[PDB]
From Swiss-Prot, chain A:
Component of the U5 snRNP complex that is required for spliceosome assembly and for pre-mRNA splicing. Involved in splicing pre-mRNA of the A1 cistron and other genes that are important for cell growth. GO terms for biological process: spliceosomal snRNP assembly; spliceosomal tri-snRNP complex assembly. The keyword Cytoplasm applies. This is A1 cistron-splicing factor AAR2. It comes from Saccharomyces cerevisiae (strain ATCC 204508 / S288c) (Baker's yeast). The modification Phosphoserine is found at S236. The modification Phosphothreonine is found at T257. Phosphorylated on serine and tyrosine residues.
Curated annotation (Swiss-Prot), chain B:
The chain holds residues 1836 to 2069 of 2413 of the full protein. The MPN (JAB/Mov34) domain has structural similarity with deubiquitinating enzymes, but lacks the residues that would bind the catalytic metal ion. This is Pre-mRNA-splicing factor 8. Present with 468 molecules/cell in log phase SD medium. Residues 7-237 are annotated as: RNase H homology domain. The lineage of its organism: Eukaryota, Fungi, Dikarya, Ascomycota, Saccharomycotina. Changing D21N: Reduced growth at 30 degrees Celsius. Strongly reduced growth at 16 degrees Celsius. It comes from Saccharomyces cerevisiae (strain ATCC 204508 / S288c). It is found in: Nucleus. Functions as a scaffold that mediates the ordered assembly of spliceosomal proteins and snRNAs. Required for association of BRR2 with the spliceosomal U5 snRNP, and the subsequent assembly of the U4/U6-U5 tri-snRNP complex. Functions as a scaffold that positions spliceosomal U2, U5 and U6 snRNAs at splice sites on pre-mRNA substrates, so that splicing can occur. Interacts with both the 5' and the 3' splice site, as well as the branch region. Has a role in branch site-3' splice site selection. Associates with the branch site-3' splice 3'-exon region. Also has a role in cell cycle. Disulfide bonds: none annotated. The gene is PRP8. It comes from the Eukaryota. Component of the U4/U6-U5 tri-snRNP complex composed of the U4, U6 and U5 snRNAs and at least PRP3, PRP4, PRP6, PRP8, PRP18, PRP31, PRP38, SNU13, SNU23, SNU66, SNU114, SPP381, SMB1, SMD1, SMD2, SMD3, SMX2, SMX3, LSM2, LSM3, LSM4, LSM5, LSM6, LSM7, LSM8, BRR2 and DIB1.
Amino acid sequence: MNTVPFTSAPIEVTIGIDQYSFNVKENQPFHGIKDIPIGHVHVIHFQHADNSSMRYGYWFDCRMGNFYIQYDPKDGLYKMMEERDGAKFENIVHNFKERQMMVSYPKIDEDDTWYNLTEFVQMDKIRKIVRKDENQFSYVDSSMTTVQENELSDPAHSLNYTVINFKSREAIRPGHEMEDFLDKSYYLNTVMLQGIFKNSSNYFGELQFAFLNAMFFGNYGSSLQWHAMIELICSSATVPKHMLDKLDEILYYQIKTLPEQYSDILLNERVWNICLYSSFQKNSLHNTEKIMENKYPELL
Amino acid sequence: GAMNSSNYAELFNNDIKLFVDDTNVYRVTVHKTFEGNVATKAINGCIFTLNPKTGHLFLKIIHTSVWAGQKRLSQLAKWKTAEEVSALVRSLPKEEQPKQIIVTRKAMLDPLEVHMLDFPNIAIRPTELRLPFSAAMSIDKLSDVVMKATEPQMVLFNIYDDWLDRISSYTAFSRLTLLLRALKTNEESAKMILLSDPTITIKSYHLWPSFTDEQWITIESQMRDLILTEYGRKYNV
C-alpha cells in the first residue's frame, strides 16, 4: 500500500481519489490519503467549494515515485509534486499516519470496480497523451481540448488522443470507398490496431482513459474520443473475438459507474443505438446491452 | 450550409457549382412472379448533374448491367452516383471543376463526401429546396437516350436550349423548374401544353420547343395554372 500526503488543505475542496470522494473544509487538518493499492494507475482530483467550474486532477502511479499534494496560493490550486528524498518522505508519511490525519483509500475487498475501469490503462501511455515530460504524473482538467479539436490552440495543454475520422483518406482506401465506410474493419485492424496502437490493449487503455477523463472532469473532447473508439469497433464487421468480449466487459463497468444524473451529456444517443441495435456488433455486447436497457432505457 | 429560399441567388453567381440528383439512378418496375411473389425488374437510369448557371447537363446513363449480382441496390445506387460524380470532376480541367456540389437528397452527402476526399476544397452541400429534377425523365429526348442505351454512357445537353441568348440564368432556371414542376405534378397535361401546337417544333439540338418570347409567357402562365389546379385537387382546397 502507498500514501499521497498533503502539505495542508488551505481551501474548502471536494477531493476525489479514483471513484471515491470526500469533502475537506477550509484549513481543516488534512494530510493525505493512505492505503492506496499499488499496481494500478490512480487519479486524485479536485473541485473547489467556491468554483464548481473546473474539476482538475492528477493521474499517477505510486511505483514511479513519491508524490504529494501542496496548495499553491499564487496559482490557486492543489498541485501534485514529487519528493526525491525518500527518507524525508517516509518521515512525513509516518508522522502524519502516527497523527492519524489521513483518510484511507476505502476499498471494499469484493470490489474490482477500479481494476475493471483501468485494466488496460498504463502510466506510460497517459504521459504520451498528456505530454509534460518533466513530471511523472499528468494534469488533466475540464477545459483541456484535444488535438483533433484544435484542428477544427496552445498545444502544450492539449490531450493528444489518437485521431479517428471516418471520412478521411486514412480510413478509406481508394477504390473501396463504399466498402470501407460501411465496414470499418480495415481502418480498425490494419490502420489503427496493427498500424498505430500495435495491439488491442493500448487501444483499450486509451478508450478507458478517455472515458475516465470525461467522467471525472466532464472533459468534452475525451467523451468524443471514447465514443469514436467504441463506434469504430461496433461499425467493423470483423473484430477479433477476444476484443468483443473484453469490450463488452469494459463498457459494462463504465456504464455501471457513470453517475445517473450525467447520462444525458455523457452518452451519445446515436453511437449507442448504432452499437447496440444497428451495427455489426448489435448481438455481441450482451452485458452492456443489458445494463444500458435496465438503467438508461430512456436514452435508447 | 444548406441551400434554401434565402440563399437562392448564390446559384447564379460566378462560383461554379453543380446540382446532383440521384432520383432516377436506380429505376425498377414491380411485377408478380409465376409463384405469385413480387419481383423487381430494373431499367436504365441516369444521374442528373446540372450547372444551373450555364445549363450544361452531364447526363450519366446507368445501364442495368451495373446492378447485376449486387445486393442492397438502393444503397449501392447512392455510392455509384458518388463514384460517377467524382469521376466527372476528375475528368474536368481544374478551372472547370465545381467549387460546390449540391445534392438534392441528403442521403447522398456521406457517399459523395467520401468519394470527394481527394477534393477537400469542394463543398458538398444539401438543400432544403424541393427541386423537381425527378421529372427529367419526362423530357422525351432525355428519356429516349437513357432507354436506348446499351452500355454506360455520358451524354451532354444544355437543358436551357438557347434561352440564355435572351434571358438571365435566374430566369432560365425558374422556367426550367416551373416546367419540371408541371411535368412532375401532371405529366400528361404538361406535355399537352408544350406540344399542343404542331407549328412550334423542337430543334434537333434542343430539348424544348422554339417558343417566341410572347409564347413562353403564355406557356409559363398555362403551367402555373396547371400547378395550382393540381394543388387544389390534391388538398381539396
